[PDB]
């Protein structure tokens, strides 16, 4: 799929993603904080349509993500990110997608997710997170 | 003066400042790098005009600042930053302003300046720098 | 188990652990780097004995860990770390223990594991890692 790399910022204000209840995650977009201003990240779009969108609007800066988890698995023969859940200090958002295949989780004891990078074809192929104090 | 705070970025591409050979530093604006792309900072302007502008264009990313130095002292009864010099791994830019008063200098053995904050009235009243690896 | 927290150091020189094929990971001890000299971490020992010791000697500083993976699962009513694998830029060490239950993995794209914390009873119950540049 198409590689993307938002870079690193000061925090996260919103995540706008889409998913399909029968397949994987599709589109992914993030509104970061950049030194107190929203920074509207590029929308990283699936090559296909037919997803359900979700808006995860965080109460920044008091609310922040403490754990990202999910599942990677096969869809049409491709290893993709099948599901995502975001837990903050306030509530849990997700699971979105299909909770099947190989689980993964990044719990954070200290620090903050400040950026995402990855790749999207028909579905989210893989992703990485920038962490900082 | 009016306080300003640019916050922190990924590095520095250009500094635009102004000065007067009898007084002090007036205006200060930085073009930061943000994740590989220019980010044009707010232009922090003196309450008065009449200054000589200077543009310091760095060959980012190979050229970066290794020392910031200057002088603080009294102009019309106010302590202000009278002079600045910026030394990179390639060249020296400055002194700009009036090199009298009390010197200061921040050499950096390891790390980068990634942001500026401060206050400007008629002249640069004070400033700080964000440092990061 | 007994909680442990080594805190953060400059890097990792050696990891000593033990495991049993019938059960899970037992003991855990790290020889860290501290500012260019070795620092022998506390040895975190199981309440019981009979495990098989392993010594992972890294060619510090050119060799570093890039991924830590493992499995968690139930042993005698306790959910513990049953298996560990450490992948460096040079080679893979492991798996050690029993590869059954729920997998986990932390790959590192940029940065270094510089410390460990967790808890050990009869087995390694859980652990976390300090990350730095």
């Amino acid at each position: 799929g198409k590689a993307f790399d938002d870079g690193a910022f000061t925090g996260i204000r919103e995540i706008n993603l889409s998913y399909n209840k029968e397949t994987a995650i599709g589109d992914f977009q993030v509104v970061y904080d950049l030194n107190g201003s929203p920074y509207v990240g590029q929308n990283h779009k699936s090559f296909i349509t037919g997803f359900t969108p979700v808006k995860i609007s965080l109460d920044f800066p008091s609310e922040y993500i403490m754990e990202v988890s999910g599942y990677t698995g096969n869809v049409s023969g491709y290893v993709v990110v099948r599901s995502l859940t975001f837990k903050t200090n306030k509530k849990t958002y997700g699971p979105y997608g299909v909770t099947s295949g190989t689980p993964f989780n990044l719990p954070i004891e200290n620090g903050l997710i400040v950026g995402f990078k990855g790749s999207i074809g028909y579905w989210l192929d893989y992703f990485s997170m920038y962490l900082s104090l | 003066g009016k306080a300003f705070d640019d916050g922190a970025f990924t590095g520095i591409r250009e500094i635009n400042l102004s000065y007067n050979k009898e007084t002090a530093i007036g205006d200060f604006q930085v073009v930061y790098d943000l994740n590989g792309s220019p980010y044009v900072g707010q232009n922090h302007k003196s309450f008065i005009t009449g200054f000589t502008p200077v543009k310091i264009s760095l060959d980012f990313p190979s050229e970066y600042i290794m020392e910031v130095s200057g002088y603080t002292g009294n102009v019309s009864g106010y302590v202000v930053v009278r002079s600045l010099t910026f030394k990179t791994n390639k060249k020296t830019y400055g002194p700009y302003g009036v090199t009298s008063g009390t010197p200061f200098n921040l050499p950096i053995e390891n790390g980068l300046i990634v942001g500026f904050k401060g206050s400007i009235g008629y002249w640069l009243d004070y400033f700080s720098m964000y440092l990061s690896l | 188990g007994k909680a442990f927290d080594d805190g953060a150091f400059t890097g990792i020189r050696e990891i000593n652990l033990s495991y049993n094929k019938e059960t899970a990971i037992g003991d855990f001890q790290v020889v860290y780097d501290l500012n260019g000299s070795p620092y022998v971490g506390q040895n975190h020992k199981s309440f019981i004995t009979g495990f098989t010791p392993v010594k992972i000697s890294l060619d510090f500083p050119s060799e570093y860990i890039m991924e830590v993976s493992g499995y968690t699962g139930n042993v005698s009513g306790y959910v513990v770390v049953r298996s560990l694998t450490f992948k460096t830029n040079k080679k893979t060490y492991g798996p050690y223990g029993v590869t059954s239950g729920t997998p986990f993995n932390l790959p590192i794209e940029n940065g270094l594991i510089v410390g460990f914390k967790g808890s050990i009873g009869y087995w390694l119950d859980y652990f976390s890692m300090y990350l730095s540049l």
Partner: peptide
């Protein structure tokens, strides 16, 4: 070394 500041990054999860 470089004028570019560095950040820890963990991942990727998904296809390799």
């Amino acid at each position: 070394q470089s004028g570019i500041s560095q950040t820890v990054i963990v991942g990727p999860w998904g296809a390799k």
